[PDB]
């Protein structure tokens, strides 16, 4: 497990587009566990709706997809660059007061490339899905 | 049970400095507990440390008293508003962070007209990490 | 055809969250054009890799999405529907999107049933393809 | 008598939480005064009032302990930090509001070892707006 | 004697392009006097020089150019038209403004015809000239 | 020719006061071109005009001396400052809108020493939206 500034010591992600607060559980070449608070502090809801604050489908695949970052990292100068994203699906919308929760597990690892399933969820609630593809360089 | 859009009804606090994400619980002239989610997202841990975030303890104080607003405010059998006036023996316990959820409880301890007096504590996991007791008044 | 005021009026979306300045051709239930300038001002680069500024794919995403939008509540039979993604699949990044790129939108229809859309969307900078997938969308009251 | 950059090159808190513009005077161990510049230019009014803008009471509490940081880092002769753990019969008198200057002043009541005891007052224009006494801790 | 709430009734300008705090003195048609307070809490300075904050030279004559339009808006008799300001000459930038300074605008009128507003303007820190600039406007 | 972490390394300009994204052609001592792409995604627009985002005036000057900043940089052989200190026949022709690409031209009509004066033109879709003659000097 890990937690945001040790995220930090492996990917380059900064505010205001470091998705993942804490790494829950880690276990190399295989699955990570991780959240995002999300609250009106955020500033996307600033626009993602006035009056009705949703958080940004595309931005829970980013969020799943830098979870799987520090997943291949830790499987430290080079780049984890995700190429694809497909069956994406978005289920139920996710609001301030959310603990969004990210789920990455390998499909496949082959030589620099990795394809995983990602979930997330609110509240054990799959809120969206997707398997994404990433090389590394 | 009581969301931010129904909140903002409620509070004029907005974006930047709504400090609470959802009320959980509010029985009138007595008690309200909410929270707030603490994210990296939040602009202020730019600034409180650079390579180490921490949540500012006078905010925790804030959000403590916008819980307070919202009991106050729905405890009138409209437009009047909470101002707070005084703090009293704050106690900052533990460094709250990203990932954490920031539980407020707000008690009442004394009403008389339009003068409240709350017990304030917040919590992460059952931790207790600040504490005060507002001054509050009504306009 | 359609500028930044105007899609405002069609979108609900608001900054920090309106990805499209500008659309250029609008053919209803068929394909729409747009595009967004991509420029250092832009709050993300300042994340999005200090001292490597690199456009989010995702972001590229959601700016087709939203032109998207714009075709979708110009092609029905009024107003407040909503219009929510609710599936992409075979999406791909191609090249870095970078600032002072002007990064171009297309999508087209590829099926319409009743209130469900299919599109096929790429994204372009000069005429290099930097993003595809196909996004389904339902619009509902 | 010190300004924004010096007080970096001591406190660590970076924009947009760093709430003193500029320390006036400085006397070791014993008072400081420094202030910040209230302006609309400032997003906190963005969404404390919408058509009504009012510099949060707390803020003010915080640049005083900003202020009052400085004196204790400058009580030196490096890298130790300054932690606020109290805070007591903090009271707020009179809105603060766009235009005005916020007139910091602290003065230590009680230094015992690591331990200080701030008495700390905030003015604008000689008006008292707010006063507390803050408690902080001082470790390496 | 006019405060930030009733400069927005008067100017469509906004945070953070809002570069008008207070206007302390207005006599119309002829003279108006308005600040605005300079701090780190700004978010220019978060890019305009990492290390060593100035502020810009071209956000001062904005300034200068929002309280003319409050002077032009207040001389006017309809009500609600546009302030477009036309050009800029002789503008001349003399000393850096840092945060902590109370940015001083003045701006008279030298010409006004019909719908056209020239404006001799200029900004101050401490009563040092820091900005001088004639600007040209015309009402819509 | 010269992209924006070359800008960078040359000015010290940053977020959110870096105005241009680009520089497309630089002959020494003599001409810059460059551009800023103009988009709903900058912060200005927020406030420079709620329901009608336009590009400040002011800005383009800004964008305009960046631009001869670096030509500046380029035409000289060390780490120096570049200060603006005048402008003058500023004129705004036509609105600057979300979408645009921002073109600025900078000339040197005159180099004495330590001292440039450029004539600076703004285009979008080569139609002058801007244009003015912009003094500068070089100091430690």
Same mark, same amino acid.
């Given at each position: ?6 995220? *930090? ?5 900064? =505010? ?11 276990? /190399? ?5 991780? =959240? ?5 502090? !955020?500033?996307?809801?600033? +626009? $993602?709706?006035? &009056? $009705?604050?949703?958080?940004? %489908? ?9 979870? %799987? %970052? /520090? ?12 190429? +694809?994203? !497909? %069956?994406?699906?978005?289920? @139920?919308?996710?609001?301030? +007061?959310?603990?969004? !929760? =990210?789920?990455?597990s390998?499909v496949? @690892?082959? &030589? @620099?490339?990795?394809?995983f399933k990602? *979930?997330?969820?609110? !509240? +054990? @609630? ?12």
């Open positions: 497990m890990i937690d945001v500034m040790q995220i *930090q010591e492996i990917l380059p992600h900064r =505010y205001p587009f470091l998705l993942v607060d804490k790494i829950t559980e880690l276990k /190399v070449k295989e699955v990570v566990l991780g =959240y995002k608070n999300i609250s009106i502090s !955020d500033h996307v809801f600033m +626009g $993602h709706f006035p &009056g $009705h604050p949703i958080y940004p %489908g595309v931005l829970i695949l980013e969020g799943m997809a830098q979870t %799987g %970052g /520090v997943l291949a990292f830790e499987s430290k100068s080079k780049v984890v660059y995700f190429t +694809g994203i !497909d %069956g994406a699906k978005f289920r @139920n919308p996710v609001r301030p +007061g959310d603990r969004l !929760d =990210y789920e990455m390998v496949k @690892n082959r &030589g @620099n490339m990795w394809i990602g *979930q997330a969820f609110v !509240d +054990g @609630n799959l809120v969206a899905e997707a398997e994404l593809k990433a090389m590394i360089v």
